Structure formats: C-alpha cells, structure tokens
Amino acid sequence: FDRLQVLDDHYRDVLKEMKAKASTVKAKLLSVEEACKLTPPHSARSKFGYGAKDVRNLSSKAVNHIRSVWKDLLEDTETPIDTTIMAKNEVFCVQPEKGGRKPARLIVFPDLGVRVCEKMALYDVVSTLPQAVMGSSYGFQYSPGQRVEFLVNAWKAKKCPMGFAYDTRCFDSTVTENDIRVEESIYQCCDLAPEARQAIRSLTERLYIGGPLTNCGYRRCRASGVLTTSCGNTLTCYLKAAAACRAAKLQDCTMLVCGDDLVVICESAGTQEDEASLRAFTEAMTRYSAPPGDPPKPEYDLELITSCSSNVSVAHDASGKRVYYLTRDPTTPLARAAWETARHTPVNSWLGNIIMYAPTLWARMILMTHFFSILLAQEQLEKALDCQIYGACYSIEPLDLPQIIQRLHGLSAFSLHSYSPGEINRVASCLRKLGVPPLRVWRHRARSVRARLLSQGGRAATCGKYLFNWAVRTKLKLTPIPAASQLDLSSWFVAGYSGG
Ligand SMILES: COc1ccc2c(c1)[C@@H]1C[C@]1(C(=O)N1[C@@H]3CC[C@H]1CN(C)C3)Cn1c-2c(C2CCCCC2)c2ccc(C(=O)NS(=O)(=O)N(C)C)cc21
Ligand SMILES: CNC(=O)c1c(-c2ccc(F)cc2)oc2cc(NS(C)(=O)=O)c(OC(C)C)cc12
Ligand SMILES: CCCCCCCCO[C@@H]1O[C@H](CO)[C@@H](O)[C@H](O)[C@H]1O
Ligand SMILES: CCCCCCCCO[C@@H]1O[C@H](CO)[C@@H](O)[C@H](O)[C@H]1O
C-alpha cells in the first residue's frame, strides 16, 4: 500500500503550536550577491555556461542568468523544474581500473541557478526557523559536549527515566507530497519579503513536490539543498513524533531530533506500561507515514540507547569527577582508517573520527597514535587535509587538533581515565577481531610519538602535551588552550586555529 497518511487531532494541535512559533520568525530575503557567496567552491556546474567560481566571485553571465531564474520563479507558479541525477563514485570500495561498473551513490539536484535562488528565498528561514520552532529539541545546534550535557541533564530531570530511539527508514526518497506542503505552510508563517513568499510557493510546487529528472523519468524524492532537506526532515519528524508522544500518552517527554533520527526521554510508568506506550507510539508514527526501521525498545540505562550510530558512556577526569561522552562501536572507524593507511582519500574519515570522538578510548589510543606516527614519518603534520564531517568538507591541519577538541569536547577530553569495562571490552574485542595490536602496544607507541612531537616545538609540541598526556606516567598539568578573542588580538598573530 506504500505511503498512506492518516492525520488526527494530536497532529493538528502540534502543527498549530509550530505555526504559532513560526510566526515569531522574521526572515530576510538574500540578494544575488549574498546568495552567490554561500555557493560551495565545488558546487556542480550550470547547464547554462557557468559553474561555481563564476557565481562564487560574481560574473555578468552567472548573475544575469540567476536573476532571470528568479524572475521566472516569481512569474511561473506551476511549470516543473528539471533536476539532474548523477552517480558520485564510492570512496571505500574497490574501483575498476581499465573497465567495469563503478560502485556509486546517486545524487539528485536542480540547476546551479535554481540552487542560488533557493538560498535567496530560504537560507535565512532554514538557518533560524528550526531552533525557533523546536527549541532544545533541535539536534543540530549542539556540539558533542553540549549534546551529552543536554541528554544527561534530561535523564537526571526524571524521577524514573525511560528512553528510546526511533529511526524512520529511507524517508528522504519516500517524502509524501503532504509533508512537503505542510513544511511550506510552516515556512509561510514567517515575516517574509513578498518575493520570498512567492519564490517559496513556486519552488515547492515546481521542484520540491516532484518533477522530471535527467542525465530519464519523474521524481518524488528530495531535490532541495542540504540545509533545506535537513530543516524539512527535522520539522516533519518533530511534528509526527510530538503528536505520537501525545497519542501514546508519554509523560514529561524530552525529545532530541536530527533529521529522521530521534530520541525521547520520559517518565517510566512501569515495564509493561512502557512496552504498551511504545507500541502506541509506533502505531501513531506509522499512521503519520513514518514507520520504524527496527521497532523501538524502552531503555532504563541512558548508555543502552543508540542513536546516530552513537551512545553515551562514562569516564573520569583527573579529579575523579564523572565525565559523560558520546562513543560508538569502533569497527567501521578502524576499517575506514585501515583503508586510508593504504590509500589517500578525499574524506579523511580518520580525522573526522578523531574530531567527533576525541574523548573515546579508541580515538585517543589508536587513531591519534597511528596517524601522528604516519604524519611524523611523512613530514606532513603542517599539511591541511580535506575532511568530511557530516554535511560539509573542511580543510583541517592536524596541528590544530588540541584547539578543535577543546572547543567541541572541553578540556576534560585530554584527561579522561577509568573508562567503563563494557566500553573497554567492546574496543579490546574489536582489536582482537581485526588483528590490531592490543591497547598496551598503543601506549608504548604513543610514548615514542609524544617524544618526537615534543622535540619539534610549537603546535607539534602542544599535540604531544595535550593529545598524548594519557600515555605518560608523570602527567603534565594541562591548562585551557586560549582562543584569540581571549588573548584580545587578531588571528594573524596567533598560530593555527585562532577564532575564524
Ligand atoms: C578490515 O579492518 C581493519 C581494521 C584495522 C586494521 C586492519 C583492517 C588491517 C588488517 C590490519 C593490518 O595488518 N594492517 C597492516 C598494517 C596496518 C594495517 C593496514 N595496513 C595497510 C597493513 C590490522 N590493523 C588495522 C589497523 C588500523 C590502521 C588504521 C588505524 C586503526 C588501526 C592496524 C594498525 C597497526 C597494526 C600493526 O602495527 N600490526 S603489527 O604490529 O602486527 N605489524 C607491525 C604490522 C595493524 C593494524
Ligand atoms: C537524536 N540523536 C542525536 O542527536 C544524537 C545522539 C544520541 C545518542 C544517544 C542518545 F541516547 C541520544 C542521542 O548521538 C549523536 C551523535 C552525533 N555525532 S557526534 C558523535 O559527532 O556528536 C550527532 O551529531 C549529528 C547527527 C548532528 C547526533 C547525535
Ligand atoms: C587494508 C584494508 C583496506 C583496503 C586497502 C586497499 C584499497 C583498495 O583500493 C583499490 O586499489 C586498487 C589498486 O591500486 C585500485 O585499482 C582501485 O581503484 C582501488 O579502489
Ligand atoms: C551512562 C550515562 C548515564 C547517565 C547517568 C546520569 C545520572 C547520574 O546520577 C548520579 O550517579 C552517581 C553514581 O555514582 C550518584 O553518586 C549520584 O548521586 C547521581 O546523581
């Protein structure tokens, strides 16, 4: 029966509350220049004789064509807009050389001109509306450290906490026409410029609801930009879930939403009562056309909930105080890093894993040790690497890792010890399974890596001091690494990542 959507009073009530909050948002219509500057340098070429760089640093051909696309969006409210379907080759896969089928992910996008028009009309709404509507439930406002703080405080707030994760399997292609229209109705509640209001209506009717796809066919999958798709999915999932919490009569809910991924922390009503409540929640979500991947399970320990491939775990700082942090099973991070040891990638998953999971036993002992050893050998500590973290691609120098880690995780990230036996066992058994040397070997290797870094001075010695303080018996004190704004001077006089 594919997608069949049934909307009730709970859904309608939550939508009114969302629209009432949306009404307090005043969003601005970006000029051609403002939108052009937001174009990524490696954004796909237009079929109209220009393509990134030209748009990015303003060009007569690019700007005048994008102004005609804009005029057409304001004047035509129904003609379907075309989208291109392309195969982007896979990174962690054996790629045929001198003939063969190339493993690839498929990407669907409108012409570059349309993409800049979408930014003019929606960038300010997508970057302001979700937080204004969902508040603390909006998952993309948090750093790993702030996210864990939010979760733990929500868990501690309950008399008898219960929590569960709910994941909607492949929604990005299966997005209903209704969901797209409901999203638009929320965006329309903002204080928009009249041209924005029309452009939003045209884009939703001509592009977002569906349209033709070419190098052909017709698509009903998301053709919006990353920021637009993210906003849409999060608002839709929040709407359906907040309504489903009411239908399931869940008490004192705290939700955390990241696109299609969600977590609810509420008050337990007893084992069998909670099991019934979750069945109720799932029935409501399924009726709202958001069925689960795996049926949700009530959890009574925060550590047992897995969401966005991660779970909360405990460690202790140097003073013995409990420190909470996000971790994950290290099999895929290690397997991808093994690949990268043999072959250079444009993603540098190892570096992204060190940044996302810096407090973890496996990122500190294995990934930092192994890659600093390689960088020392190759004399490439200074070389900025392109690193993909979630959406974006960042250029990161390994020498700036202490500063980055402190910003995202806090100073405790460098002093953690007394990790949970279960967490250690997951790491240890994983090393045995993959043929990786045990943790005792990594300590020996890190003492040598730290020594070589210290001898190099500057940022290299700060990497030695902060990142490998776990490897020495006689530990250094470790004070916060000061930001350029704290020092009260320009980033030009501050080595590495300063505050830009
Ligand atoms: C499929 O999933 C995985 C996952 C992990 C590993 C492998 C495969 C690779 C099988 C192993 C291997 O033997 N390798 C050698 C060395 C590194 C890795 C990849 N490389 C292309 C060839 C076993 N093996 C893996 C890693 C990873 C390297 C990146 C950072 C994280 C650890 C190792 C790191 C050091 C040794 C280590 O030092 N082993 S040792 O002491 O027995 N010896 C000196 C080689 C062995 C490793
Ligand atoms: C809705 N779920 C969440 O927001 C997340 C949870 C979580 C895990 C267990 C729970 F019990 C509750 C939440 O863990 C995460 C880890 C990351 N990445 S990271 C490791 O880089 O921080 C994340 O960042 C991206 C997607 C923005 C979002 C979440
Ligand atoms: C160590 C475990 C991870 C695998 C590392 C090997 C990476 C495979 O990489 C492959 O190498 C071939 C030979 O140059 C190329 O022909 C392929 O295009 C490439 O995908
Ligand atoms: C795995 C992450 C679980 C998060 C638990 C947050 C609640 C912490 O709770 C604390 O636990 C301590 C345990 O020794 C007790 O001493 C404290 O009294 C209690 O408030």
From Swiss-Prot:
Catalytic activity as recorded in UniProt: RNA(n) + a ribonucleoside 5'-triphosphate = RNA(n+1) + diphosphate
PTM notes: The N-terminus is phosphorylated by host PRK2/PKN2.
Record: residues binding Mg(2+) 2: 167, 260-261
Cofactor(s) recorded in Swiss-Prot or TrEMBL: Mg(2+)
Subcellular location: Host cytoplasm; Host endoplasmic reticulum membrane
Lipid bilayer topology: Single-pass type IV membrane protein
Ranges of residues in domain RdRp catalytic: 161-274
Regulation: Activity is up-regulated by PRK2/PKN2-mediated phosphorylation.
Free-text cofactor note: Binds 2 magnesium ion that constitute a dinuclear catalytic metal center.
Job of this protein: RNA-dependent RNA polymerase that performs primer-template recognition and RNA synthesis during viral replication. Initiates RNA transcription/replication at a flavin adenine dinucleotide (FAD), resulting in a 5'- FAD cap on viral RNAs. In this way, recognition of viral 5' RNA by host pattern recognition receptors can be bypassed, thereby evading activation of antiviral pathways.
Name the record gives this protein: RNA-directed RNA polymerase
Native organism: Hepatitis C virus genotype 1b (isolate Con1) (HCV)
Location of this fragment in the whole protein: 2473 to 2977 of 3010
